[PDB]
């Protein structure tokens with residue numbers, strides 16, 4: 392299909408040009424006013440900030456250099472910055488600035504005020520199948536783009552999918568994304584979403600993203616994920632077992648798609664066969680989807696989040712507000728030379 396082939400051909404050209412020549416050091420901390428902490432966790436902190444000269448709002452991610460305990464954490468944060476400054480796609484949050492100082496690394500991204508898909512899912516209870524299909528189509532197109540660049544995403548989960556002013560998805564957190572020619576081996580990802588070959592410490596590939604899409608569609612349509620338990624070891628036992636139970640309200644087409652995405656044998660899993668992403672796009676559950684219309688954002692969304700303005704934080708939750716301290720002396724300079 393030639394218009395698709397040439398689209399992805401140009402996508403890859405434009406990615407490689409930025410990949411081979413990353414930008415660095417494009418602002419500093421005292422160019423911004425701090426407003427509110429939007430989240431804190433294994434990813435560091437994300438704060439709402441306002442640019443003093445333009446008045447524009449941004450989401451600033453702050454990483455503390457000295458909390459590194461493993462060399463793979465350094466590699467992961469360098470992956471994230473280099474990939475984000477090189478990609479361009481309608482459903483990916485855009486990186487606007489990056490920089491570092493004596494104590495921290497900073498990635499300054501567009502601010503999306505509608506909140507996390509996770510909050511809206513837990514408030515509504517479950518999404519109808521048309522609503523879940525609207526969000527799933529956007530992830531299918533995003534993985535078609537990323538995989539064609541030889542990138543694997545490895546952190547799909549509802550907390551990472553923000554809802555924008557038009558009710559469409561923006562994917563955030565490239566902390567585990569990586570450029571991969573064949574296989575890769577790191578143990579990473581949230582337990583509920585891990586594919587069997589990650590749990591079994593095998594060399595793995597882009598098929599782990601299509602497994603995670605199966606978990607995400609099930610969770611959107613049921614209201615809970617297919618494999619859960621109080622201990623990760625119990626979660627892992629269900630994931631590798633080859634057994635999943637579907638609610639009776641699931642359509643027959645939905646069950647059939649999920650059995651093919653949640654296929655424990657990676658050589659039989661949809662997205663990883665000879666026809667690649669088209670086994671998914673041509674499946675009966677997507678028969679009503681206009682793929683070009685979704686890409687061009689011409690489809691009316693299932694709902695628009697309620698918010699008052701580009702600086703409204705009411706769709707995020709409350710965290711203890713802590714200092715952003717920047718030591719008199721530099722820490723960990725060499726290890727982060729490339730940032």
Ligand SMILES: CN(CCc1ccccc1)C[C@@H]1OC[C@H](N)[C@H]1O
Nearest residue numbers: 433434454458459464467468566567
């Ligand atoms: C990339 N790492 C941070 C590495 C690091 C950097 C500096 C210091 C300590 C550690 C975070 C993970 O990315 C995806 C996942 N949602 C999040 O846990």
